[PDB]
Amino acid sequence: KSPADIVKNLKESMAVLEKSDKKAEKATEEVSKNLVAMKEILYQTEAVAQLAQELYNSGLLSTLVADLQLIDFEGKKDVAQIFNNILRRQIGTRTPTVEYICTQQNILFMLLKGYESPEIALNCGIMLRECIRHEPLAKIILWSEQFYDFFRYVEMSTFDIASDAFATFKDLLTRHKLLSAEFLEQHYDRFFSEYEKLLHSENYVTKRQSLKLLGELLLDRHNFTIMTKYISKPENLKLMMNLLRDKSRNIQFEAFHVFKVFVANPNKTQPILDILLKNQAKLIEFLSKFQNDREDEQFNDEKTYLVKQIRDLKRPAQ
C-alpha cells in the first residue's frame, strides 16, 4: 500500500527471516517484493519524505543492515541502493539520515564488520563509502577501534575484497582533509606502526597502492606536521631507500616519490642528514642512472633536482 504499509510489511518479513522452507521461501519472496516496492517510491516528493520518516522511526533501516546476510542476492543490492538514496535526503540545509546515523552508530559498526562476511562485504563497502562522503560519519569510523580492522582487511587472501576495503580505507584517509589531518596527528604512532606493515605486504597490489597513498598523504598541505615527523625518522628513510632497489619497477618509482620528500626537506634532523652523507656519492651515482629509460620529463627534472640536492648536502654549525 503506502510507505508506512510497505515499511510495516518489510519489517514483519524481516522478522520471519530471523526466526523454515515453506515459511522461509514466502518471507524471502515477500522481502524481495517489498524491497522492489520501496525502490519504486524513490524513483510523490512526500511519499519519499514519508518513507524516510518511517524508515527512521520503525528501526527498519537498521534492521536491513543487521539482517543483510539473510537477504537474497539482488535484494542485498536493493538495500544498498535504497540506503544510498535515503542517506542523501535533504531538508533545507539538514541531512536527516546523517543526523540519524550519528545517533544510530551501530549501523556503521555493523557495516564495517560486514567486510568479514564474503556474501555481503562488497555491499557493505558500497554503503560505507557513501556514508564516508559525510564528514560526521567519516569521523565516527576513523576514530573507532574498528578503523584498525582495515589493516587486516586490505591484507585478506581474497584480493577483490581486499581491494574494495583499500578503496574505503583510502577514501577515509583522503576525503575530509582537516579531519584526516587531525586523526593522523593524534594517532600517529599506532597508525604508522600499522602502515609500515602494509609497505611489506605480499599482495603486490596492496603494497604498491599503500606506497602510492603514503606519497599522496605526505604531499597534502593539510598533513604538514605529519609529514615533517615522518621524514625525520631514520627507519623511514632506510625503508624508502631500500625500496628504490625493489625488484618491482613501479615500487621503486613510488618509493622515489616519497624519497624526494625526505631530500627536499630544508631542515633535516641529524640522523637523516647523516644517512644521506654516508651514501652521498652512491646516491648521486644511483640517481644519475635511475630508470633513465623512463620519457616522463617531470621525473627527469626531479632526478636533476635530487642529484643537485645530494651534491650540495652539508653539515651545519655543530
Binding site: 631514520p234 632506510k238 631507500m241 631500500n242 644517512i275 654516508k278 651514501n279 652512491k282
Partner: peptide, 4 residues
Amino acid sequence: DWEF
C-alpha cells in the same frame, strides 16, 4: 648496497 646502501650503508646505514
